[model samples]
Target: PRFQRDFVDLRTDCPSTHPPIRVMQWNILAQALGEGKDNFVQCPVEALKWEERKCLILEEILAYQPDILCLQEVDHYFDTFQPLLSRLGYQGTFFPKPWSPCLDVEHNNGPDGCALFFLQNRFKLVNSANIRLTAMTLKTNQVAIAQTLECKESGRQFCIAVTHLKARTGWERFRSAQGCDLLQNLQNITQGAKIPLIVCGDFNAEPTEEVYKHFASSSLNLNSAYKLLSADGQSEPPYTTWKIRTSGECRHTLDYIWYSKHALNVRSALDLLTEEQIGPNRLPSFNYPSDHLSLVCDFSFTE
Candidate 1:
């Protein structure tokens, strides 16, 4: 299918009516697209010969004028995105994995991790920070990036956090540890004040596990969009991966958009790219470009 048309009028509504804030979390398979063609194993069979897949990804992204956009696995695309997004009325901040030698720590090179993009006209960035728990969970070698943003017009501010937790078939133990550190840092940032917060990313785990519980509970009491709206779990959690490669397809939900009920209220949410709609060879195909689909949620101030 195509980018959902319901989202066409999504951002046109004025904040004066409700000040809706739309967010999208996606794993764009940036690394697979950036790395040499030798690594096509992470992609579909036809993707190898496709030169314009990246354009497709960009086109799909530009379709929606979300207030906030969070992405993971953008190893080499940060440089490619910065100038483009700037022209599209977005101010972008990128953070690469601490251990990614290919990527500049400032996030202009081939780094692998998260990139946050906000509508320049709607939000003013206060500050941004990165969190990586090396000593405690060294095996996962992943990180989270957060941005403190306020509505340019409303003066209402909140934190938007994005992360890609450890990805492996087994080792929920380490994955759980990753979640703990992420939660701690997220908590530490908003410690002094009561700002609305929305945490989203690819957790690489499922709702049935303790790792999922860590973010779902604790003092944060973050409400996941999936759980909030009663969305169905993918028959194959790995289907969210949007890949047919051996390492891509498997089990369990790995992606989510969680928010603080005290600060933000969920209005509507969507999970995009499914097997029934696209078949097994989902992404990097004609319609999609990543091994993972996207999760988008719309929210308004709760208080």
Candidate 2:
């Protein structure tokens, strides 16, 4: 029903020895949260209906054909994504927030959290962890999932993590603490970056946020993959999320795919929809299924 965006080549000079690993990261706005809570004042109620929106979501995934998928705010894990994706050869793991805000909504489906998936035919899982993120040593509602997988084709191994952090303006320090906790956990899991890594998440914090800075300066040798889309290759996209709430129009770059700078080479990336294509109402509209746009990239292990 909508125009599909195409992937743009980044570095075609270095062709991959094995097949390029296609990874998709998305915050597929939870059904309960998008319709009941979240407060998208401008979006029509019918557009958020699960029946049509689910088709749009699946269309995006099928078009991209990702080998690995990481999603946040996934409320339809068991009922929709799990069984359907399983039939497509993708094995998935979900980690729900212990105390999800979706429970407060009327007639909610269930808890909304993070989900990570990879094609079983492409990779064999070595280790996986479900992390309950902490802020200043206290467990918070935010959660993350990390999986270490070895490619069946090349036998190369890498760690991938998906997470959603605390949202809102006043939680800067808290998000930073949560980022620290996640990094520490990843450090232990990867044994101090000996294993290459890729992390995907809707951090809910912009590039200027303390949490973003923490990741940029961390010892993990991380770099945001979407930066390659920029003209200068140093700036992030103008916005990853745009919506109209009770207050007014809001736009921000709050999602990211951070990968090991030296370990992985980003070959190509999905181009963002133009402002004209997105239209005036912004995201989660008739065409798009979520407020945050999906980030898709083709990455290959570096020699």
Candidate 3:
């Protein structure tokens, strides 16, 4: 009941647009991490239970019905999401973290990582790359997945990538280096921005973070989709994730849907959940399955 949200159109009208492709970005809190590791101080243990939580996750995805979905913290790729989303006509791919923090939790599931999926009926796969992010020449635990797909009808190609960067404070420099590595890799993959690109992730960095600055100034000419929701179209949402943990109340804009500004147009974006509706519990509640709110946007290739 609380999950029903609407898309706010960014443009008043666009008569020459092709059918828009829906893209969704979310860090669907890994089951093992949510249940055993991440101490969601306000959320009940039962709320993180896979039984009902999985249903909530699936329901959210089904409700939005994104054509291209980029998800992080996906520990249930084989057991749950792949089978189910595949049945719904989605071709999915998963890239597990080399040493997921989830493994430290007692009786944990396999390593949690990023997952990317696209509706097979809409696009055909061109190429895919699984990247192990490096910082100062050493491969880090973080990873990313990039896939290029060609629209069946329009014959246009775009590259979509998903990643989860290093978390917590004081690792800012490391995260910035990882961002540089990703940008360099993306430069090679897209052949200097020849292919339109959409990159999504829970970057784990605030607007002030150096990593954020790197993306904003990158040569790809990208724009964050949710920024369109701001009246001036220049600021990010106040929060994409809000949760209470043992450390304290943690609320920040850590997720983003970045698309090539020159190659695509953001037609609409899902509104952020209001604080009143999110309630004092924050997230990963009885109705919501993840700590982070899903960021969804409808985009069209520029004509």
Candidate 4:
């Protein structure tokens, strides 16, 4: 499939002024009903049924009309996420968490893991690979996967790595380990290649956390797109990506999109208004988009 390739030359293929590509990354929480969940937050009203939620999610994705989307916590094979995504003019590559008996299939196996979805006509995939970095246990292991793409119009190539590091207890250590592994893998892959790279995921860590520190220490030559978008002189406050709804107090910055220095030409980056700006009254509602808001970036490339 053209969706997975070794390398592609974009200079001679992609159109020149196709408008800056809009890329979005989000963790949809697997469309869980939230009503019966035992651990973590729970949904009060049925909200929308699983199928309805999935449809609403697709609708919102179509409305944003992103050229590329990186998703985390996507369901296991049992769920029809891929088929639904295909209908929206996108294709995805996924990395599932290691199998575990502890996993609750009724909720989600936590398999089917992180994935990358892209518009086929806009970008040609050059190569795709995944690295399982840490095996915390038979049940928990962190994996990072990437898709190298060539802009059919610009002839320029770039890589998109989608990751979902370990969350909860000892997140700092786990994230640091995962971050280091990701950087090493990326460095090895791009060795001498000068193409741009975008690493996006539900980091499960905030900007000021130790995990962020470790990533900065790697000297990956990447900038936090979120920080770049914040208002001048305005630093990132401790914003939350999830909530209990009952108390509306649990919050954290767990989702993020980091870009390589190669993306210095980025014009803007933002958390789509789908949740942050629209609030609860927004069309399709916040729950439809996912528990975490989608981080979107718009940028250009030049020779």
Candidate 5:
């Protein structure tokens, strides 16, 4: 209970060394994938039948080669993306919305949820926990999955938590509570260690809002990859989701890659740093992909 003059039993430092970890976050619109179905976000019907979107998705993902990927909206993941990502040398697991209208368990198909994939060469999974964000959950949706991994190279254990917070308008309180729940879940697993934890997702809120600031509180002590790096007195970062239907058919900053500076040093980031950078195009483009632009961050262990 004290530093005391006679006792020495604890170490309060992070791991000394480890290879950099790169993480990717994307809300890959699953509303329009496969067959003749297409929704908002301008995914042309021809793009579905003619163009190999999944191949393009694979190409973009492989191009980055992130150590970990947290993807939202994985419709029919088993038949579609699971195989593709598996072949790419990644082991992935999916958690669907608790009560998605499209879920057909007997048929083994459903609407999108979240999929997290990691490379075995780099990490070995130690422990994992899934948090249901709300009681309203179908016992499956509104979830956050946390995993502890032992780095193969460094043998250091760290946490990578992925979540898709409650979105849509008029759900601000739900979103805030969900954020707190996600934080406590991580804190529960890595309480004393604080071993380089990262939470990635589509938060659906801005830095100035209470929902976004929840991570900034002392208890959580997290740094948003986008907010921390953006210069002072700047307009909010560029809207990650544009051409929207998710939140008013307009642009807004609704996603992030948040981490702890006490345990990590942000190495690099792929973010639009200022609102001026917001433009006509968002994602799910032939070159770009998804209505929400993917957020990428690279981190190195700090000691």
Candidate 6:
């Protein structure tokens, strides 16, 4: 079931040629989270073996070569992979929530939670900061970082927000509140700006759920790119992107790329994976690229 090296070149069959910008979102589960004593391959369950899984995840990402990458569940303290990404021609910036020793370590309450990466030549980050939600009582706080950039061809300015929301059973209430907070923050940032906005992240809820619905309704006239691409009533290929790995049987779209009303001319969006890619035995590539599938979208702003 392992994918061959050639599988790396596989492109989206439903391509978008609308001169739209491309953005990708993925959650690479730091391999170190597994349980193990010495962090050795034999100790497969060790929570600190993220070093071993880093290569596979990086390879998969390098193959796709996205202009922008939004990642969740990244080790806040790991500096090894960031430098490696720079060597591979990609630059990354992280805004980890301040560490809290009182929180449980297993839930990443004390580690780096989420981050964003963009290609250097394609983006000039104007400003970036972490948005902390005051309503959430959990040890881990949701965060968003904004980056302003000018399109090379269009000479137009745009904004990008990379975020990761609260997750846990019975935590929906907090997540919903955080979602509203994010929307309000976004509105304030884009108040007088005339450029398009793209918000990408792992919302920890399905598209049909209330958390998502609330965010869509309050979040600046934005819409999910997945729904737009699936307007024909077609369903996404099965694969869960969070918590557990289930192929086909699991039903939910937890990872997403949401664009503001200005970017609605979206030409295409898809959950960037096929049945073959999700098959077992794909090694660190499948296992380390988070428990979720990467989401990609390409759309034009002028249409």
Please report, in order, the local distance difference test score of every candidate based on alpha carbons: 0.68, 0.91, 0.92, 0.63, 0.67, 0.60
Better of 4 and 5 by lDDT: 5
Ranking by TM-score: 3, 2, 1, 5, 4, 6
Candidate with the larger lDDT of 1 and 3: 3
Off by over 4 Å in 4: 1-18, 32-42, 76-78, 100-102, 105-110, 135-140, 237-240, 245-248, 271-289
| Clash pairs detected, candidate 4 | 5-126, 10-155, 11-155, 13-152, 14-152, 14-153, 15-153, 240-252
TM-score of each: 0.82, 0.98, 0.98, 0.80, 0.81, 0.76
Q: Per-candidate RMSD vs. true structure?
A: 4.7, 1.0, 1.0, 7.3, 9.6, 5.4
**lDDT comparing candidate 1 with the true structure:** 0.68
Superposition TM-score, candidate 5 onto the true structure: 0.81
Best by lDDT: 3
- Candidate 2 residue lDDT tens string, 1-303: 445677888964675577899999999999989977788987889999998789999998998899999999999899899999999999999999998888988988899999999999999999989999998789999999999999997889999999999988899999999999999999999998999999999999989988999899889999999998999989999888989888889999998999988889999988788878888888878888999999999998776
Q: Return the candidate ranking by lDDT, descending.
A: 3, 2, 1, 5, 4, 6
153 Cα displacement, candidate 4 (Å): 1.7
Task: Residues 1-303, candidate 5: write the lDDT tens digits.
Answer: 001112111122345455668798888766433332334455444444323556656766876778999987677588777887888778888887776544533332466677888988888999878677753342325767788888887887888888887766777777887777677668788875467788888887776667787887736567777654446613346677765333335767888777776777766666442333333433444444456767777777775
Clashing pairs in 1: 103-111, 237-252, 241-291
How many clashing pairs in candidate 2? 0
The segments of candidate 1 whose C-alpha lies over 4 angstroms from its true place after superposition are 4-17, 33-51, 100-109, 135-140, 229-239, 247-251, 271-274
Least lDDT summed over 10 consecutive residues: which range in candidate 1?
A: 5-14
| TM-score of decoy 1 | 0.82
lDDT by residue for model 4 (1-303), tens: 001111112122234354777788777765442323422335434453566567666765766678888887766433666777777678788777785222554664355478788998889888878778653432247678888888887777888888888876666776776777777778777654366778888788877777777665556677666665455513452453645554443567777776665443455555334244434433224344455666666656643
